[PDB]
Structure 1
């Protein structure tokens, strides 16, 4: 609320065929100490939406309670799968929250990504939802996908690839050089690994113990964390 203390590094989000891919290093640095090297920095609101994080951890946690409990209220007044809120809804909600906190001058020292799938014609997961506990992938049109961004100042937009932190110079350059449309999972993961390798080799606050999450027709898939090949 007054300044950053415990900081995360950066996240990368890209859309491809069958869904989107979002990645983040599991580390939160206490300045120049690196106290925590196993932190969950990618969160889930519901199926077909996730929340990114690069900044102060307390604000991300507060926004995580707000967003996940907004999803709880959505489920508690749900009757059909189409009544589930889209990533546009949550992205606008975070944008309004950041704008209001800016006007009050009590900001959140974070740079959020909201991304997922803004359509329901591809899977029947949301008709009978499963919060606690939990085929072939179905190709998803890029128009039905969505990736968004929220700045400290509330600035927002949408694009096929969005990154935060120091990845907005390194990884954004690699994506603008190399990002195609409808790349398979292997090519996307190779590109993400190359960008995170370049970040690890030239960013103190980053690391190699990477978390990777996917948002597809099957739903949100928290894969096993892996150390980068380097």
Structure 2
């Protein structure tokens, strides 16, 4: 494309003992005003991996359709539960399509964050595209990657994009602990998103807290 016309906000992806926690607001600004205020940005691409948008939103559906077809293609040869595409494989694919566009002029402005469970030691050999307790993950099987528009790819324990890389990340680099509980995770993200609501113009309420536990992918809609 050319020019981030429909700019989106940023997401915050942290991990803990029960799984990944990715949250974002549902406000997509068009230029200088909130045109759409009910658009999701945490797209699910697998039964164990999710991905988040940032920046341009119209270009983001092009990358979402490219990844959801790979999920159905990978599901076509699922003759074992270990043949599923791990989040590290999805992260290397997005980092590759971003680099190919980097060689050309069109860069597809985005700040894609791929997060999920990088293991297959949990029974999920029955996938349903359309429609009890948690587990404890070793912190090494919880992959959370980041992909810049220039093709920069890496992975950490907590990944913060867009405008929250200057506000939520600084509050997260000193308060994040290893193997946090479920309630301590959303009490930190809701507290860091509150700062983003006061010091950012293209941000608002309507948080979409998405958690990737060891039993699936859920969805919620708080209001801070």
Q: TM-score, normalised by structure 1?
A: 0.94
- Matched residue, 1:113: 113
What secondary structure sits across from 1:154 in the alignment? Answer: coil
Relative distance call for 1:114 and 1:78 in structure 2 (3 A) is same
Residue 139 of structure 1, CA deviation: 1.0
CA-based RMSD: 1.4
Relative distance call for 1:125 and 1:137 in structure 2 (3 A) is farther
Cα distance in 2 between the residues matched to 1:125 and 1:218: 12
Cα distance in 2 between the residues matched to 1:68 and 1:99: 20
Residue 123 of structure 1, CA deviation: 3.4
Residue 104 of structure 1, CA deviation: 1.3
- Matched residue, 2:183: 186
Equivalent residues of 1:21, 1:214 under 8 A apart: yes
- Structure 2 gaps, min length 5: none
Relative distance call for 1:50 and 1:138 in structure 2 (3 A) is same
- Structure 1 gaps, min length 5: none
Q: TM-score, normalised by structure 2?
A: 0.96
Relative distance call for 1:213 and 1:16 in structure 2 (3 A) is same
Equivalent residues of 2:207, 2:221 under 8 A apart: no
Cα distance in 2 between the residues matched to 1:125 and 1:225: 32
Kindly provide the CA deviation profile for residues 114-159 of structure 1, in whole angstroms up to 9, marking residues without a partner as x.
010010113335567766xxx1111111101100000011001110
Equivalent residues of 1:8, 1:27 under 8 A apart: yes
Kindly provide the CA deviation profile for residues 50-101 of structure 1, in whole angstroms up to 9, marking residues without a partner as x.
1111111111100110001110111112111111100011100000000000
Number of equivalent positions: 224
Relative distance call for 1:127 and 1:61 in structure 2 (3 A) is closer
Equivalent residues of 1:148, 1:157 under 8 A apart: yes
Cα distance in 2 between the residues matched to 1:37 and 1:127: 32
Relative distance call for 1:126 and 1:176 in structure 2 (3 A) is farther
